[PDB]
Amino acid sequence: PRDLSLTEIAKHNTEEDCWVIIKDIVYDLTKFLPDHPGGKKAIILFAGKDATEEFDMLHPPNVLKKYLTPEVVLGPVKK
Numbered sequence: 240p241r242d243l244s245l246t247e248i249a250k251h252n253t254e255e256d257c258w259v260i261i262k263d264i265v266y267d268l269t270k271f272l273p274d275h276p277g278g279k280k281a282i283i284l285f286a287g288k289d290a291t292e293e294f295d296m297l298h299p300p301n302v303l304k305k306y307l308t309p310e311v312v313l314g315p316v317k318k
């Protein structure tokens with residue numbers, strides 16, 4: 240299908256093509272990378288993976304809503 244399955248998500252695992260799962264929502268962070276105040280590599284480390292725990296422990300609850308636009312919010316993981 241090429242939808243938001245874990246299999247498909249895992250393929251977006253480079254700086255050039257970087258998806259990250261946070262609370263079962265897929266974000267395309269490729270263009271956000273140079274904009275990230277925590278640097279590119281911290282996110283690239285989690286490219287194609289779930290970053291929920293590390294995100295929750297490193298950021299205030301208000302960050303997601305203040306830094307991202309709808310164009311990078313791809314949707315929920317398909318189980």
Ligand code: HEM
Binds near residue numbers: 298
């Ligand atoms: C989901 C999209 C994300 C947004 C909008 C975002 C935003 C930010 C912002 C605004 C800061 C500076 C304020 C702060 O210290 O919290 C920051 C710092 C940081 N972020 Fe991100 N972040 C995102 C994803 C991630 C991911 C996936 C990681 C990897 C675990 C990460 C790791 C870090 C680290 C290590 C810092 C430095 C913390 C410090 O020096 O106090 N972030 N993030």
